[PDB]
Amino acid sequence: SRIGKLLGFEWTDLSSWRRLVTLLNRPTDPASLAVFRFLFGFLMVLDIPQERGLSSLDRKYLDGLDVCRFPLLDALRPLPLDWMYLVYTIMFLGALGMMLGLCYRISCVLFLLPYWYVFLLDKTSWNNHSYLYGLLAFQLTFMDANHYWSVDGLLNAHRRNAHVPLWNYAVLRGQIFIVYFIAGVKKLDADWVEGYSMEYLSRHWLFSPFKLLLSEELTSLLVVHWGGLLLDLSAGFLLFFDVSRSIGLFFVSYFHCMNSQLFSIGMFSYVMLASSPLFCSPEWPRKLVSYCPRRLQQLLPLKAAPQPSVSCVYKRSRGKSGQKPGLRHQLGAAFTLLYLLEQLFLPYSHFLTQGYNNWTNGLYGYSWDMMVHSRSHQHVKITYRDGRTGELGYLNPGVFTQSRRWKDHADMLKQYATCLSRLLPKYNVTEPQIYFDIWVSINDRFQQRIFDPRVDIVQAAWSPFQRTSWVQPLLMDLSPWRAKLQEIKSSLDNHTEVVFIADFPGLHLENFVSEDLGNTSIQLLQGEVTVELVAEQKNQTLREGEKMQLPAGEYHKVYTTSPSPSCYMYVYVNTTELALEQDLAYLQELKEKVENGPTPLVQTFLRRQQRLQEIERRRNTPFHERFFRFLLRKLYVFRRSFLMTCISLRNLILGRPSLEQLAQEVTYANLRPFE
Amino acid sequence: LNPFINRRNANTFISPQQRWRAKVQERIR
Ligand SMILES: CCCCCCCC/C=C/CCCCCCCC(=O)OC[C@H](COP(=O)(O)OCCN)OC(=O)CCCCCCC/C=C/CCCCCCCC
Ligand SMILES: CCCCCCCC/C=C/CCCCCCCC(=O)OC[C@H](COP(=O)(O)OCCN)OC(=O)CCCCCCC/C=C/CCCCCCCC
Ligand SMILES: CCCCCCCC/C=C/CCCCCCCC(=O)OC[C@H](COP(=O)(O)OCCN)OC(=O)CCCCCCC/C=C/CCCCCCCC
Ligand SMILES: CC(C)CCC[C@@H](C)[C@H]1CC[C@H]2[C@@H]3CC=C4C[C@@H](OC(=O)CCC(=O)O)CC[C@]4(C)[C@H]3CC[C@]12C
Ligand SMILES: C/C(=C\Cc1c(C)c(O)c2ccccc2c1O)CCC[C@H](C)CCC[C@H](C)CCCC(C)C
Ligand SMILES: *[C@@H]1O[C@H](CO)[C@@H](O[C@@H]2O[C@H](CO)[C@@H](O)[C@H](O)[C@H]2NC(C)=O)[C@H](O)[C@H]1NC(C)=O
Ligand SMILES: *[C@@H]1O[C@H](CO)[C@@H](O[C@@H]2O[C@H](CO)[C@@H](O)[C@H](O)[C@H]2NC(C)=O)[C@H](O)[C@H]1NC(C)=O
Ligand SMILES: CC(C)CCC[C@@H](C)[C@H]1CC[C@H]2[C@@H]3CC=C4C[C@@H](O)CC[C@]4(C)[C@H]3CC[C@]12C
Ligand SMILES: *[C@@H]1O[C@H](CO)[C@@H](O)[C@H](O)[C@H]1NC(C)=O
């Protein structure tokens, strides 16, 4: 058998359906599966009060507040606060049961159902690790992970070191491999291979050793971008093979240890770290507990030969011939194959749901593309027209929203428009017409509109499978300007800013220059524009290279007349900031000179000096005090969540008390126990 | 609350935006 140890099977095992089913149901030691289940349950229990928002459920789901919500389906509606607290309690109990191994199936379902309900209840909280947690819970629901290191097996006799079918490990290994490979392939983008997505991450002190032999640009392009792409592409291949298993394990451990500190992504790094030993032999915990000193080998459960189990099948040459697969053996193989096909196909299913395709393909959360695209927003304007009288009015951007993700997606914008249309009659406004004007620059590009500002979103047509017509295309033929843009940005002073704008033909921009924005100018780059002055009604055509100067405290308009998109910049200085800083420097230096031989302006410098001194003292202060403060904050969050959940459970079960008792209980809930 | 603003306050294109940290779409908050 040449390939009988580099792959774990033979070529003859994939020649027929019966042979494949027999292979996929091979018995296997359940030790590593049990360890993974324990770790995943522990991490989910630790994570539910923090990331899922159990501590802010009262803030998010108040009884009578006006808020616009963004569910996947408008038929899904939230429950009152008490029932939401009950659902979170059920989720916590399910996670605890999954960790402990007691009542495995019931706990798995009790964690799976409310988790997916909460996930689907809101489209603005989707990311990749929440999707991964849901997928992992779904997979573990159908697996026998309570056969070792559990409590069910300590009450039963057959779940004590039994055997599990082979596909239990195959599904998890495949899931991790698809995660790594799809992330690596998604990182084969123009903005990533050219070092544009993360151009500031290399300045962290964790990259200091690389700066000894490499330049800053070289260490930002070679290490963060190309190294990350290579590791993403090769982690699965390195981990699968036993020849290079140790090297791959070291690399992935180092990668996740740095990632747990570079960003704040919750428990993603720890889940990935705990999922790495799954690629090792299924019996590694047994060897690890055999290698420990003999003085601690008599308290843990005895290491003996595993007993036979009914879940898997046994094919022996002398121990009988063959057991015909039933409706449980073939179902495992079918589930494995179909689930792997679905996981491989879903990230590339953006050609079917065309209504979710903005500048970036699809809804964010299930495509395994992390940090690839970065967005910076410049201005948002919401304008409504009264349908009864015709007055023009302006709304605050995001009055009734608890998130900011609606500015990038057309479906979320449509939902927000409908919600505003519903809630505006409450404020003496007839049936309105709302127009949106949002300027977004992606991956350090020109600032440009994303949606058409001349279309009424309330009456617009949006369909999941139809490409949206009021979404402005991305100006793809302007990226090579980025080098010149960076040069211009770096060729400026420490108090002068620049903003680069690209405008479509036929549209116009109305801007109000602030009073304190003295020395403001506009310079053209491409095409031709017409600059207007509202107060005196004077147009002025401009060409490439020309420069203007705009007065402060007045309106002005910029019109695009060229048959191609045009680009220009704004150059401005905060003259009020300059004057304040220069007088502050005078009043400080001269005061020091007189002393060595209050008012708000002095107060700002006093606060800055106090903050600098505190920062220096904290830097000199050892990390133990910060660790203690972190522990105190976590304990406060946990205690608040527990007290509020108990309060809501008492209210739901016993009965609603008087108002006075609730106020006292709420005040006791937030106390910051000790400091 | 008050969901209305003026015309000179809804047209200030050049202003300190907000920039609430990185706020990447994979951050917890
Ligand atoms: C680039 C695209 C992918 C290219 C092909 C991948 C080549 C190999 C690299 C894969 C790295 C990790 C992915 C693992 C996925 C599942 C296979 C697996 O876990 O194997 C374990 C297990 C053997 O393990 P042990 O005997 O413990 O051996 C330990 C190894 N030293 O392998 C098997 O039993 C293989 C089962 C038969 C194949 C079925 C699984 C393959 C799933 C493919 C996904 C698509 C589903 C249907 C396939 C259609 C086309 C065949
Ligand atoms: C109740 C009595 C029971 C007796 C024993 C109890 C066991 C529990 C002991 C563990 C300590 C408990 C921790 C309590 C909570 C700690 C605080 C906490 O989680 O903080 C979160 C903090 C991150 O903070 P953020 O909030 O992201 O910070 C940014 C701020 N926005 O997360 C953590 O610290 C996670 C800690 C858990 C890590 C889990 C480690 C498991 C992974 C190890 C895998 C092992 C593999 C070994 C390889 C084998 C190779 C052969
Ligand atoms: C069911 C939960 C699945 C969870 C999976 C998570 C990861 C996958 C992510 C999937 C992304 C999108 C796929 C889901 C498609 C269904 C979306 C849907 O029905 O909701 C859209 C819409 C809400 O619109 P918004 O803009 O949010 O609100 C505007 C009003 N204020 O909902 C509705 O109104 C219901 C409309 C039902 C449409 C679904 C039709 C059922 C499909 C069968 C048709 C067969 C194909 C038709 C032609 C095929 C052409 C390819
Ligand atoms: C003397 C008076 C003021 C009593 C006040 C005591 C509180 C500070 C106690 C009461 C309930 C306690 C909580 C009860 C339950 C838990 C669950 C417990 O859950 C776990 O995560 C442990 C198991 C695991 O690690 O998975 C963590 C501690 C915590 C929040 C306890 C923290 C401290 C609390 C809030
Ligand atoms: C921020 C980066 C990727 C985004 C990302 C994150 C955050 C994840 O959590 C992922 C988890 C699973 C799959 C994909 C993920 C993902 O795509 C690259 C960060 C680059 C990294 C910090 C550089 C370390 C790699 C160096 C080159 C190793 C050095 C080895 C040489 C010295 C030989
Ligand atoms: C208004 O701002 C511009 C740009 O910041 C100033 O122009 C600079 O003038 C100095 C000389 O005083 C030159 O060295 C710089 O190269 C100029 N900048 C650019 C971008 O060309 C201008 O002086 C300012 N005007 C006032 C009255 O402060
Ligand atoms: C300034 O130039 C514009 C040409 O762009 C003149 O006409 C306006 O053109 C835009 C372009 O679509 C239209 O939207 C406006 O309705 C046009 N009229 C006005 C009053 O803006 C504009 O008239 C010129 N203004 C002056 C004072 O000459
Ligand atoms: C009480 C109610 C709301 C619970 C909702 C449970 C339903 C809607 C949940 C339970 C299990 C979930 C499935 C679990 C796994 C996957 C695979 C993924 O690649 C696409 C979504 C999909 C197919 C999920 C769709 C939603 C789902 C079917
Ligand atoms: C800086 O300019 C902004 C307008 O862009 C203004 O609101 C702010 O007050 C200025 N800074 C100072 C110190 O006045």
PDB file of N, CA and C in Angstrom, chain A residues 324-377:
ATOM      1  N   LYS A 324     -25.190  -5.318   6.450  1.00  0.00           N
ATOM      2  CA  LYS A 324     -25.798  -4.472   5.435  1.00  0.00           C
ATOM      3  C   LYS A 324     -26.127  -3.106   6.030  1.00  0.00           C
ATOM      4  N   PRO A 325     -25.661  -2.013   5.426  1.00  0.00           N
ATOM      5  CA  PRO A 325     -25.964  -0.686   5.973  1.00  0.00           C
ATOM      6  C   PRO A 325     -27.461  -0.420   5.991  1.00  0.00           C
ATOM      7  N   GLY A 326     -27.911   0.240   7.047  1.00  0.00           N
ATOM      8  CA  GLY A 326     -29.304   0.580   7.238  1.00  0.00           C
ATOM      9  C   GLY A 326     -29.617   1.995   6.806  1.00  0.00           C
ATOM     10  N   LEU A 327     -30.555   2.619   7.518  1.00  0.00           N
ATOM     11  CA  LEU A 327     -30.945   4.001   7.267  1.00  0.00           C
ATOM     12  C   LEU A 327     -30.191   4.981   8.159  1.00  0.00           C
ATOM     13  N   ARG A 328     -29.186   4.502   8.893  1.00  0.00           N
ATOM     14  CA  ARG A 328     -28.391   5.375   9.745  1.00  0.00           C
ATOM     15  C   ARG A 328     -26.970   5.489   9.210  1.00  0.00           C
ATOM     16  N   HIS A 329     -26.474   4.423   8.582  1.00  0.00           N
ATOM     17  CA  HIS A 329     -25.125   4.429   8.030  1.00  0.00           C
ATOM     18  C   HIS A 329     -25.024   5.224   6.733  1.00  0.00           C
ATOM     19  N   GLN A 330     -25.974   5.043   5.814  1.00  0.00           N
ATOM     20  CA  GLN A 330     -25.933   5.783   4.557  1.00  0.00           C
ATOM     21  C   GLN A 330     -26.265   7.255   4.759  1.00  0.00           C
ATOM     22  N   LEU A 331     -27.088   7.565   5.763  1.00  0.00           N
ATOM     23  CA  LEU A 331     -27.442   8.955   6.028  1.00  0.00           C
ATOM     24  C   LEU A 331     -26.220   9.770   6.423  1.00  0.00           C
ATOM     25  N   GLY A 332     -25.289   9.168   7.165  1.00  0.00           N
ATOM     26  CA  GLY A 332     -24.075   9.882   7.523  1.00  0.00           C
ATOM     27  C   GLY A 332     -23.252  10.271   6.310  1.00  0.00           C
ATOM     28  N   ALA A 333     -23.056   9.325   5.387  1.00  0.00           N
ATOM     29  CA  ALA A 333     -22.306   9.622   4.171  1.00  0.00           C
ATOM     30  C   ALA A 333     -23.014  10.674   3.327  1.00  0.00           C
ATOM     31  N   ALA A 334     -24.336  10.546   3.178  1.00  0.00           N
ATOM     32  CA  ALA A 334     -25.080  11.524   2.393  1.00  0.00           C
ATOM     33  C   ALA A 334     -24.980  12.912   3.008  1.00  0.00           C
ATOM     34  N   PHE A 335     -25.116  13.005   4.334  1.00  0.00           N
ATOM     35  CA  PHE A 335     -25.003  14.293   5.005  1.00  0.00           C
ATOM     36  C   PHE A 335     -23.615  14.883   4.825  1.00  0.00           C
ATOM     37  N   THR A 336     -22.571  14.064   4.971  1.00  0.00           N
ATOM     38  CA  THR A 336     -21.213  14.567   4.789  1.00  0.00           C
ATOM     39  C   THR A 336     -21.030  15.150   3.394  1.00  0.00           C
ATOM     40  N   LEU A 337     -21.399  14.381   2.367  1.00  0.00           N
ATOM     41  CA  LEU A 337     -21.175  14.826   0.995  1.00  0.00           C
ATOM     42  C   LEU A 337     -21.979  16.085   0.679  1.00  0.00           C
ATOM     43  N   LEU A 338     -23.274  16.080   1.010  1.00  0.00           N
ATOM     44  CA  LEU A 338     -24.119  17.228   0.699  1.00  0.00           C
ATOM     45  C   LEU A 338     -23.688  18.468   1.471  1.00  0.00           C
ATOM     46  N   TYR A 339     -23.326  18.308   2.746  1.00  0.00           N
ATOM     47  CA  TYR A 339     -22.896  19.446   3.544  1.00  0.00           C
ATOM     48  C   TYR A 339     -21.606  20.040   3.002  1.00  0.00           C
ATOM     49  N   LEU A 340     -20.664  19.191   2.584  1.00  0.00           N
ATOM     50  CA  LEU A 340     -19.424  19.719   2.028  1.00  0.00           C
ATOM     51  C   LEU A 340     -19.665  20.419   0.694  1.00  0.00           C
ATOM     52  N   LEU A 341     -20.550  19.874  -0.151  1.00  0.00           N
ATOM     53  CA  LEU A 341     -20.897  20.577  -1.387  1.00  0.00           C
ATOM     54  C   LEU A 341     -21.519  21.938  -1.099  1.00  0.00           C
ATOM     55  N   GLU A 342     -22.442  21.996  -0.136  1.00  0.00           N
ATOM     56  CA  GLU A 342     -23.091  23.262   0.188  1.00  0.00           C
ATOM     57  C   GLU A 342     -22.090  24.275   0.723  1.00  0.00           C
ATOM     58  N   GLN A 343     -21.180  23.836   1.595  1.00  0.00           N
ATOM     59  CA  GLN A 343     -20.185  24.751   2.143  1.00  0.00           C
ATOM     60  C   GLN A 343     -19.204  25.223   1.079  1.00  0.00           C
ATOM     61  N   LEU A 344     -18.913  24.384   0.084  1.00  0.00           N
ATOM     62  CA  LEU A 344     -18.030  24.804  -0.998  1.00  0.00           C
ATOM     63  C   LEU A 344     -18.723  25.746  -1.975  1.00  0.00           C
ATOM     64  N   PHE A 345     -20.034  25.597  -2.161  1.00  0.00           N
ATOM     65  CA  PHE A 345     -20.738  26.379  -3.170  1.00  0.00           C
ATOM     66  C   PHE A 345     -21.287  27.702  -2.642  1.00  0.00           C
ATOM     67  N   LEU A 346     -21.673  27.769  -1.367  1.00  0.00           N
ATOM     68  CA  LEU A 346     -22.323  28.978  -0.863  1.00  0.00           C
ATOM     69  C   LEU A 346     -21.486  30.248  -0.989  1.00  0.00           C
ATOM     70  N   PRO A 347     -20.182  30.266  -0.690  1.00  0.00           N
ATOM     71  CA  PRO A 347     -19.427  31.522  -0.839  1.00  0.00           C
ATOM     72  C   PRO A 347     -19.376  32.045  -2.265  1.00  0.00           C
ATOM     73  N   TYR A 348     -19.651  31.209  -3.266  1.00  0.00           N
ATOM     74  CA  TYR A 348     -19.617  31.623  -4.663  1.00  0.00           C
ATOM     75  C   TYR A 348     -21.009  31.620  -5.284  1.00  0.00           C
ATOM     76  N   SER A 349     -22.034  31.898  -4.477  1.00  0.00           N
ATOM     77  CA  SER A 349     -23.415  31.922  -4.937  1.00  0.00           C
ATOM     78  C   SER A 349     -23.931  33.340  -5.144  1.00  0.00           C
ATOM     79  N   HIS A 350     -23.042  34.287  -5.439  1.00  0.00           N
ATOM     80  CA  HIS A 350     -23.436  35.682  -5.570  1.00  0.00           C
ATOM     81  C   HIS A 350     -23.989  36.022  -6.946  1.00  0.00           C
ATOM     82  N   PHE A 351     -23.925  35.100  -7.904  1.00  0.00           N
ATOM     83  CA  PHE A 351     -24.508  35.342  -9.218  1.00  0.00           C
ATOM     84  C   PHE A 351     -25.997  35.034  -9.268  1.00  0.00           C
ATOM     85  N   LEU A 352     -26.571  34.510  -8.187  1.00  0.00           N
ATOM     86  CA  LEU A 352     -27.997  34.219  -8.115  1.00  0.00           C
ATOM     87  C   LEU A 352     -28.778  35.278  -7.351  1.00  0.00           C
ATOM     88  N   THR A 353     -28.258  35.736  -6.213  1.00  0.00           N
ATOM     89  CA  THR A 353     -28.900  36.786  -5.422  1.00  0.00           C
ATOM     90  C   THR A 353     -28.283  38.121  -5.827  1.00  0.00           C
ATOM     91  N   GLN A 354     -28.702  38.611  -6.994  1.00  0.00           N
ATOM     92  CA  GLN A 354     -28.149  39.833  -7.559  1.00  0.00           C
ATOM     93  C   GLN A 354     -28.625  41.092  -6.849  1.00  0.00           C
ATOM     94  N   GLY A 355     -29.725  41.025  -6.102  1.00  0.00           N
ATOM     95  CA  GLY A 355     -30.206  42.186  -5.379  1.00  0.00           C
ATOM     96  C   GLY A 355     -29.414  42.537  -4.145  1.00  0.00           C
ATOM     97  N   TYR A 356     -28.518  41.650  -3.719  1.00  0.00           N
ATOM     98  CA  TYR A 356     -27.641  41.892  -2.583  1.00  0.00           C
ATOM     99  C   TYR A 356     -26.239  42.297  -3.015  1.00  0.00           C
ATOM    100  N   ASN A 357     -26.041  42.585  -4.300  1.00  0.00           N
ATOM    101  CA  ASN A 357     -24.723  42.881  -4.857  1.00  0.00           C
ATOM    102  C   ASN A 357     -24.557  44.393  -4.970  1.00  0.00           C
ATOM    103  N   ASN A 358     -23.853  44.971  -4.007  1.00  0.00           N
ATOM    104  CA  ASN A 358     -23.387  46.349  -4.055  1.00  0.00           C
ATOM    105  C   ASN A 358     -21.985  46.356  -4.664  1.00  0.00           C
ATOM    106  N   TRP A 359     -21.224  47.432  -4.449  1.00  0.00           N
ATOM    107  CA  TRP A 359     -19.804  47.467  -4.791  1.00  0.00           C
ATOM    108  C   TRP A 359     -19.105  46.164  -4.417  1.00  0.00           C
ATOM    109  N   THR A 360     -19.408  45.637  -3.235  1.00  0.00           N
ATOM    110  CA  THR A 360     -18.914  44.343  -2.793  1.00  0.00           C
ATOM    111  C   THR A 360     -20.018  43.301  -2.938  1.00  0.00           C
ATOM    112  N   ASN A 361     -19.629  42.100  -3.358  1.00  0.00           N
ATOM    113  CA  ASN A 361     -20.588  41.053  -3.693  1.00  0.00           C
ATOM    114  C   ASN A 361     -21.255  40.508  -2.435  1.00  0.00           C
ATOM    115  N   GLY A 362     -22.586  40.489  -2.437  1.00  0.00           N
ATOM    116  CA  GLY A 362     -23.349  39.758  -1.449  1.00  0.00           C
ATOM    117  C   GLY A 362     -23.411  40.435  -0.093  1.00  0.00           C
ATOM    118  N   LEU A 363     -24.243  39.860   0.772  1.00  0.00           N
ATOM    119  CA  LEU A 363     -24.333  40.290   2.158  1.00  0.00           C
ATOM    120  C   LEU A 363     -23.097  39.838   2.923  1.00  0.00           C
ATOM    121  N   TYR A 364     -22.616  40.693   3.818  1.00  0.00           N
ATOM    122  CA  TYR A 364     -21.410  40.374   4.568  1.00  0.00           C
ATOM    123  C   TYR A 364     -21.714  39.382   5.683  1.00  0.00           C
ATOM    124  N   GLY A 365     -20.888  38.344   5.793  1.00  0.00           N
ATOM    125  CA  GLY A 365     -21.002  37.428   6.907  1.00  0.00           C
ATOM    126  C   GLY A 365     -20.771  35.963   6.603  1.00  0.00           C
ATOM    127  N   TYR A 366     -20.803  35.568   5.327  1.00  0.00           N
ATOM    128  CA  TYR A 366     -20.710  34.146   5.017  1.00  0.00           C
ATOM    129  C   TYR A 366     -19.823  33.838   3.813  1.00  0.00           C
ATOM    130  N   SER A 367     -18.862  34.702   3.487  1.00  0.00           N
ATOM    131  CA  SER A 367     -18.004  34.494   2.329  1.00  0.00           C
ATOM    132  C   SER A 367     -16.536  34.308   2.686  1.00  0.00           C
ATOM    133  N   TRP A 368     -16.185  34.340   3.971  1.00  0.00           N
ATOM    134  CA  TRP A 368     -14.811  34.126   4.434  1.00  0.00           C
ATOM    135  C   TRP A 368     -13.837  35.115   3.794  1.00  0.00           C
ATOM    136  N   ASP A 369     -14.211  36.395   3.793  1.00  0.00           N
ATOM    137  CA  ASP A 369     -13.334  37.475   3.328  1.00  0.00           C
ATOM    138  C   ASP A 369     -13.186  38.483   4.465  1.00  0.00           C
ATOM    139  N   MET A 370     -12.060  38.416   5.165  1.00  0.00           N
ATOM    140  CA  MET A 370     -11.807  39.246   6.334  1.00  0.00           C
ATOM    141  C   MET A 370     -10.775  40.318   6.003  1.00  0.00           C
ATOM    142  N   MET A 371     -11.061  41.555   6.411  1.00  0.00           N
ATOM    143  CA  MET A 371     -10.160  42.703   6.283  1.00  0.00           C
ATOM    144  C   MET A 371      -9.846  43.062   4.833  1.00  0.00           C
ATOM    145  N   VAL A 372     -10.489  42.409   3.865  1.00  0.00           N
ATOM    146  CA  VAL A 372     -10.138  42.630   2.465  1.00  0.00           C
ATOM    147  C   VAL A 372     -10.517  44.037   2.017  1.00  0.00           C
ATOM    148  N   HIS A 373     -11.716  44.498   2.366  1.00  0.00           N
ATOM    149  CA  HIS A 373     -12.209  45.804   1.954  1.00  0.00           C
ATOM    150  C   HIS A 373     -12.404  46.703   3.165  1.00  0.00           C
ATOM    151  N   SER A 374     -11.978  47.954   3.030  1.00  0.00           N
ATOM    152  CA  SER A 374     -12.107  48.961   4.072  1.00  0.00           C
ATOM    153  C   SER A 374     -12.895  50.145   3.531  1.00  0.00           C
ATOM    154  N   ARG A 375     -13.771  50.700   4.363  1.00  0.00           N
ATOM    155  CA  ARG A 375     -14.653  51.786   3.962  1.00  0.00           C
ATOM    156  C   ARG A 375     -14.451  52.988   4.869  1.00  0.00           C
ATOM    157  N   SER A 376     -14.441  54.175   4.267  1.00  0.00           N
ATOM    158  CA  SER A 376     -14.381  55.434   4.998  1.00  0.00           C
ATOM    159  C   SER A 376     -15.474  56.342   4.460  1.00  0.00           C
ATOM    160  N   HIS A 377     -16.350  56.808   5.346  1.00  0.00           N
ATOM    161  CA  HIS A 377     -17.494  57.614   4.948  1.00  0.00           C
ATOM    162  C   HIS A 377     -17.220  59.088   5.204  1.00  0.00           C
TER     163      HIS A 377
END
